[PDB]
Design a protein around this ligand. Sequence first.
Ligand SMILES: [Br-]
Ligand SMILES: [Br-]
Ligand SMILES: [Ca+2]
Ligand SMILES: [Ca+2]
Length: 326
Amino acid sequence: QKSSFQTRFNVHREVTPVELPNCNLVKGIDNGSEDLEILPNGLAFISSGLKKSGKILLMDLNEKEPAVSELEIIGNTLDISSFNPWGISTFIDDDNTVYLLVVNHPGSSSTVEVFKFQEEEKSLLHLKTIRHKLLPSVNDIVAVGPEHFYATNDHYFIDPYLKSWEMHLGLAWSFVTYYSPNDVRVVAEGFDFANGINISPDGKYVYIAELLAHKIHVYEKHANWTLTPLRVLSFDTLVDNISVDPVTGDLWVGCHPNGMRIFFYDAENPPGSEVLRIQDILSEEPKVTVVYAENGTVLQGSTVAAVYKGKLLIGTVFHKALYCDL
Ligand SMILES: [Br-]
Ligand SMILES: [Br-]
Ligand SMILES: [Ca+2]
Ligand SMILES: [Ca+2]
């Protein structure tokens, strides 16, 4: 028991540094940047202020030193006042409309909010609130249409007091749901805190991070939307969000080296950050490289990292964000 805790929360881990030439804190990000996603054109959406307001931020990564702006959410179908965004995902339709899907925790429950991005206006037009009995505790999603996605539930329970028991007992009842207007079903289950999720650029593989098991599961994804287990990779770190580079298919993964520091926050012992790159994920020996790692004297609690034209943007649960030369 105390032993399965020590191993799940990686309570002994310390971080060997892995430095990058020229990293700057992103001015204006001080209360989290837990998930982010960069469009083919170099615009980056970042969710923030996870639990100032909850906000969706925008950076144009083509700029020299991109400044962050807050997107204005418009519409009457959403109460912005309890907006508490977590994972996000984007979907670009055949006419090039950009949809942004955002996991929301307005109180103890979960929804997925769907927005249309209005580029000229720098605004997000709310379209729909999605909720469902198979989306009890949503952590992140990956969109495969305007209202179609796979979602991880990082717990089975909705009530925060039961969630906490569920996590501490190690039930491993976290699960993944495929959501679409006519067909919502469980596609995988039995995880110890499923969390990041993404898809290969050809749509044939789904990747799921299992935070407290320290694993990334690769599933074949089929024409009828079902998933079947294909590979599992293991790590000496808590894997959080997965980003996928569209040119190569590489995974870029934000990680928490030591789970004690990220789960029991202590300002005198803050969590560090760590970013992995994973290549040739189907091969017999996937290539895993630590691209960036530190103990938190600069960036605390890295959750996500993605690359665009030689630059690496790294977000955190509740702290800052870093933009680096690769
Ligand atoms: Br519940
Ligand atoms: Br750490
Ligand atoms: Ca995401
Ligand atoms: Ca997370």
